Amino acid sequence: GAWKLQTVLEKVRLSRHEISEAAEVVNWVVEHLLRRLQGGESEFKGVALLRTGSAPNEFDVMFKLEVPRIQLEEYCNSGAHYFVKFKRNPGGNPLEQFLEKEILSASKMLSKFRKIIKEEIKNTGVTVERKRGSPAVTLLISKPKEISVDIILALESKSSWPASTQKGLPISQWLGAKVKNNLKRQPFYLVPKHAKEGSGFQEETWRLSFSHIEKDILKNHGQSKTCCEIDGVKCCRKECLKLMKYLLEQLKKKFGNRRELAKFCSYHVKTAFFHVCTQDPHDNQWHLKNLECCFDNCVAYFLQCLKTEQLANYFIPGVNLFSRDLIDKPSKEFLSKQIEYERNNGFPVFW
Ligand SMILES: [Zn+2]
């Protein structure tokens, strides 16, 4: 009880109320816009909502677009980025006007996407800011409350997951082979996300997105089916993830005046957390009463990731989120030093 983590969890929860009401607002706007696209005659007719995914004035949502016969070409042997292409369909491809020869232009598609949402924003109390660099068409909600909502276009493919994901999702000892097999039968998504710097080639690439698998695993996170249910026993997995996210955000805000923490995000700790679930697959390794030791274990694993510059994408093992290509050594050293300090002093940044 020395770290008083339950009190920290209460602090984090208290905040859940305001964002709960912003939902009504986002729900209202977004669902309308969807109806609009679906009823119009644009290439985004087949658009639908994806429920996947703190700071209460900022949300993002994903509009998926089924597209069949998707073929993927790996971009520069990177397991995450891909060119999307199509062979000739005798019928029309609704995205045919975005192709240059066989391959899909993310830029021309996003440009068009942004264009027609702008035309459909016609009442109001809501606008869309000029392009942040980000793929998202971001909405600015004036009233009732002030809300930023980023709309992320995604392609949905119902084909088998790409080869790069072959050794990914190492959950066989934890959630089991049947769950793993069923998750991998689910569709995957492609999102036009590329680095700020980058060639025009990169700007036309798409990266794999498994946010829906992540959500499923977090919500169904126990080896026992009764984990955290009333007729079961409570684990601390979700509490550890929340605390890890909270530690990073409190640190990013404490040191927002320097560059070293700018490239770290919640996805890094979530990724590290999933690896810890794989190392410790049994519910009895996560008893709620041992919250402190479990949190400490997650923190130590994350420190080992920083030091060794190794944090493999959970779904795409060939992708190292902590490679020196992506985050320089001094940045990881800085975060390492702060996390060691926090850990040695019972996490003062929580208070
Ligand atoms: Zn549980």
UniProtKB/Swiss-Prot annotation:
- Can you state the subunit structure given in the record? Monomer in the absence of DNA. Homodimer in presence of dsDNA: forms a 2:2 dimer with two enzymes binding to two DNA molecules. Interacts with nucleosomes; interaction is mainly mediated via histones H2A and H2B and inactivates the nucleotidyltransferase activity by blocking DNA-binding and subsequent activation. Interacts with PQBP1 (via WW domain). Interacts with TRIM14; this interaction recruits USP14, leading to deubiquitinate and stabilize CGAS and promote type I interferon production. Interacts with ZCCHC3; promoting sensing of dsDNA by CGAS.
Q: Where does 2',3'-cGAMP bind?
A: D60, D150, K193, R207
**Name of the protein:** Cyclic GMP-AMP synthase
- From what organism does this protein derive? Sus scrofa
Q: How is it modified after translation?
A: The N-terminal disordered part (1-134) is phosphorylated by AURKB during the G2-M transition, blocking CGAS liquid phase separation and preventing activation. Phosphorylation at Ser-266 activates the nucleotidyltransferase activity. Dephosphorylation at Ser-266 by PPP6C impairs its ability to bind GTP, thereby inactivating it.
Q: Where is this site: Arginine-anchor?
A: R88
Upper lineage is: Eukaryota, Metazoa, Chordata, Craniata, Vertebrata
Q: Record-annotated residues binding Zn(2+)?
A: H221, C227, C228, C235
Q: Which residues carry this modification: Phosphoserine?
A: S134, S266
